[PDB]
């Protein structure tokens, strides 16, 4: 989920290495002035790296990470609006999507917001994370 973002449109090209020359493109990049929020879920304690690289230019991200303690999660089931993004390909049985808004993207479109029926984790009073998602679970 994008918390703060900015875009730069910067051109890039292929080089004239030879002394004689006779293509090029514009990249709308997300800029250094930006911060995004994600959540990882695991069965076990995880040594997550404090630096990662993304995208066309192997671009550095600072990851600052906190474990959500059992004093602030709760488990429940019913109907909930997920304010986070979600990938519909990873949606299991025992979750169903009632309503959704999408962001169209290769390799697959995401939901940017959805109403679901199924089990969830109230990790704070204003976000709900779908329980039991795993890579390709619809497929």
């Amino acid at each position: 989920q994008p918390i703060h973002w900015s875009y730069q449109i910067n051109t890039f090209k292929a080089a004239q290495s030879a002394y004689y020359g006779r293509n090029y493109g514009r990249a709308k990049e997300l800029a250094v002035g930006s911060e995004f929020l994600t959540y990882i879920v695991s069965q076990k304690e995880l040594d997550l790296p404090v630096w990662i690289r993304l995208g066309k230019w192997s671009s550095k991200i600072r990851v600052e990470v906190e474990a959500i303690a059992p004093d602030q999660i709760k488990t429940a089931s019913g109907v909930y609006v997920c304010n986070h993004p979600l990938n519909p390909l990873d949606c299991p049985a025992n979750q169903q999507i009632l309503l959704y808004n999408r962001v169209v993207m290769p390799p697959s479109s995401l939901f940017s917001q959805s109403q679901l029926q199924g089990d969830y984790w109230q990790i704070d009073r204003n976000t709900f994370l779908p329980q039991g998602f795993h890579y390709g679970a619809t497929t």
């Binding site: 994008p2 875009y7 949606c91 309503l99 390799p107 479109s109 917001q113 109403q115 497929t139």
Partner: protein, 680 residues
């Protein structure tokens, strides 16, 4: 009128909406002064009023005409109980509520309650609280509705629960429905949107909010949703009939998939067995069609187009438009004047540099464009007939700052036919300017501006245009090819504002400034210095420096004197500092320079020396006042001009010598004008 009034008052009826016409006639022009200067509070309040008005218009019995006036005032105060009854009294007379109706202060008990229970000692004016039921539920409808950011923001329970249950409490019996289009593309997206509008309008859906990517509609509760397979072939027939009429006086196949990829009407059936196919497909001719629509309907050239220097300004909404304001922006984009900076200067140098004057100029050429498409992506475009870039950019850069200041819209100015598409926090700047001529980067004005910065930018841009057109221009031919040199000298050292003034005088074949221009060019120096201390200090010092020598030397400007005369003590202070060996101290330079000033004054005729010329006072004290008036000036020139500002370096004083001398001549004329006025 302001441009925003001028556009809005065309959208309203001849009759039975007149109270909203009294708002545009009287409250609006005061509003955009106080709230006008992300989102702007003037555009929030305007959309808030219109959205409350448009629900009030649907209400199944009409509320009484006394309540309508209080709805309009309360929604105007609401972002700013005895601790509030005074703050509506203080603000309401400043916002000209007395021109809307003088009675408004009588209703202050209700007007303060609508803008935030007790009676508080102020008994209610309203006929019964049977009117306070619909009134508060109307007022709270617009206030929620104008903080939506996308057509989907009605489907999330986060704001949609209250927007439904307020509609339920108002008893409207009409449901929210949407269309949304996730890719926006010049004329083609505007055509797609307006074919959805005309197609759903035959189902008696009526639009309630407009967004950059879609519409929300009030609709019947017993309505069939239009079927996916019908609106797809209709919007193909739609674009095909408009290009059809142009030709008369693959492209379906890629387009039918383009709607199924990017269009949604609320409640069309989908399964997530579709996103399996979207991944399987992963394991354009559209923008060429959109360009063909620009050639057809904007009348831009085929195959030769960069040589017309086409710059496009794209006017996105701030967040939400009400139905009346998208109609107002229709009257803009088809009716905008081809701007001439020659009268824009004249109406801003007149009116004493207040950019709020710019609101009043004739920016256009009771709606006349009702057959034209509603502008979801409102683009305006320039053409110029000299062939250079700075000449291409001067009008777009001005328009791209101006239109956000007049209308609260968000601008991108670009050579690019594809825009940045705006959305709820892409909106975090008001303006972008993609690749302006280097006069922009030289001024150091940002290429991206937040809404608070737009009036600083308009001030610097008009101050440099109104300074370039004075010198390095000719009356029929503005010579914007020289604008980068006019900017580079003004930015290097602020006294160059007076160096440019003097160039103007020489072109004009005039030896002396008018009395008006002596303050005008000072307000430009005082304007360009605003953020920089070292320039502000130099401008304060240059006035003080002459205000000190004007204690002991005064050539009367009526006798039409030379610059040599006006500057006799400054020219002898500088010529002594610069000519003397670089080894000698400041505290010796002051004595030899005050000696030379004393020797020079004794060579002038007596009437030029204010301290000696009054024989009313004894000679030994006239001498003491002359020696201390010379000494304090010589101490300012050697300490503050040479020592402090010019860092004690003779190269840095020698390059500034002539800019100081021009600035001091304008300062002497400003002090003389100030004396001959304030002596009354």
């Amino acid at each position: 009128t302001t441009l925003l009034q001028t556009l809005l008052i065309r959208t309203l009826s001849e009759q039975k909406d007149y109270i909203l016409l009294e708002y545009f006639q009287t409250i609006l022009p005061a509003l955009e002064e106080h709230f006008g200067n992300d989102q702007t509070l003037a555009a929030h309040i305007l959309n808030a009023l219109l959205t409350t008005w448009n629900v009030m218009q649907e209400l199944e019995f009409p509320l009484n005409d006394i309540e309508r006036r209080l709805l309009c005032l309360g929604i105007t105060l609401h972002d700013y109980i005895q601790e509030i009854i005074n703050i509506c009294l203080e603000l309401g007379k400043r916002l000209n509520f007395d021109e809307f109706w003088a009675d408004w202060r009588d209703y202050i008990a209700e007007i303060s309650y609508l803008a935030q229970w007790s009676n508080a000692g102020y008994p209610f004016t309203i006929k019964e609280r049977k009117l306070d039921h619909p009134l508060r539920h109307l007022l709270t409808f617009g206030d929620v509705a104008v903080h939506l950011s996308s057509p989907h923001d009605l489907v999330s329970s986060t704001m949609g629960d209250r927007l439904r249950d307020l509609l339920n409490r108002l008893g409207i019996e009409k449901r929210f429905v949407y269309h949304h289009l996730r890719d926006t593309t010049g004329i083609l997206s505007n055509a797609i949107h307006n074919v959805i509008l005309r197609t759903v309008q035959k189902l008696d859906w009526k639009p309630l909010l407009f967004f950059a990517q879609g519409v929300i509609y009030f609709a019947p509760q017993d309505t069939e949703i239009p079927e996916r397979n019908e609106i797809k072939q209709i919007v193909w027939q739609g674009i095909s009939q408009e290009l059809g009429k142009k030709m008369s006086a693959p492209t379906r196949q890629i387009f039918e998939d383009y709607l199924d990829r990017y269009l949604e009407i609320q409640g069309w059936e989908s399964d997530h067995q579709a996103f399996i196919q979207e991944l399987e497909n992963y394991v354009s001719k559209i923008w060429s069609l959109e360009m063909l629509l620009r050639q057809a309907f904007w009348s831009v050239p085929s195959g030769k187009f960069e040589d017309q220097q086409p710059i496009f300004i794209y006017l996105y909404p701030a967040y939400v438009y009400a139905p009346q304001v998208v109609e107002a922006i229709r009257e803009l984009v088809y009716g905008i004047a081809s701007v001439n900076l020659w009268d824009v200067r004249k109406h801003w140098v007149n009116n004493k540099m207040d950019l709020t004057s710019l609101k009043s100029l004739p920016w256009l050429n009771q709606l006349k464009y009702t057959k034209e498409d509603l502008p979801f992506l409102a683009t305006v475009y320039t053409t110029t007939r000299e062939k250079t870039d700075t000449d291409a950019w001067v009008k777009p850069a001005f328009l791209a700052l101006l239109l956000p200041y007049l209308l609260g819209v968000k601008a991108i100015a670009t050579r690019s036919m594809v825009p940045l598409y705006r959305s709820d926090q892409d909106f975090r700047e008001s303006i972008h300017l993609d690749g302006v001529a280097g006069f922009w980067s030289l001024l150091g004005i940002p290429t991206d501006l937040r809404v608070e910065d737009i009036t600083p930018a308009l001030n610097k841009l008009l101050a440099i245009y109104t300074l370039h057109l004075a010198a390095r221009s000719s009356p029929p031919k503005a010579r914007w090819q020289d604008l980068p040199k006019t900017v580079q000298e003004v930015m290097t050292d602020v006294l160059n504002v007076f160096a440019l003034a003097e160039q103007g005088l020489r072109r004009e074949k005039r030896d002396r400034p008018y009395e008006s221009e002596v303050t005008e060019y000072w307000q430009f120096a005082e304007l360009f210095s605003q953020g920089n201390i070292v320039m502000t200090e130099k401008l304060k010092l240059t006035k003080r420096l002459v205000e000190e020598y004007r204690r002991f030397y005064q050539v009367e400007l009526s006798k039409k004197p030379s610059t040599h005369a006006i500057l006799l003590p400054l020219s002898k202070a500088l010529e002594q500092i610069l000519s003397v060996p670089d080894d000698w101290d400041e505290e010796e330079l002051i004595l030899q320079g005050s000696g030379q000033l004393q020797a020079a004054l004794d060579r002038q005729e007596v009437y030029t020396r204010p301290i000696i010329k009054d024989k009313s006072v004894a000679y030994e004290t006239r001498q003491l006042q002359e020696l201390e008036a010379i000494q304090i000036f010589m101490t300012t020139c050697v300490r503050d001009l040479f020592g402090e500002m010019c860092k004690g370096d003779r190269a840095i004083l020698q390059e500034q010598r002539n800019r100081i001398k021009s600035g001091a001549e304008f300062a002497y004329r400003l002090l003389a004008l100030e004396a001959q006025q304030n002596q009354n």
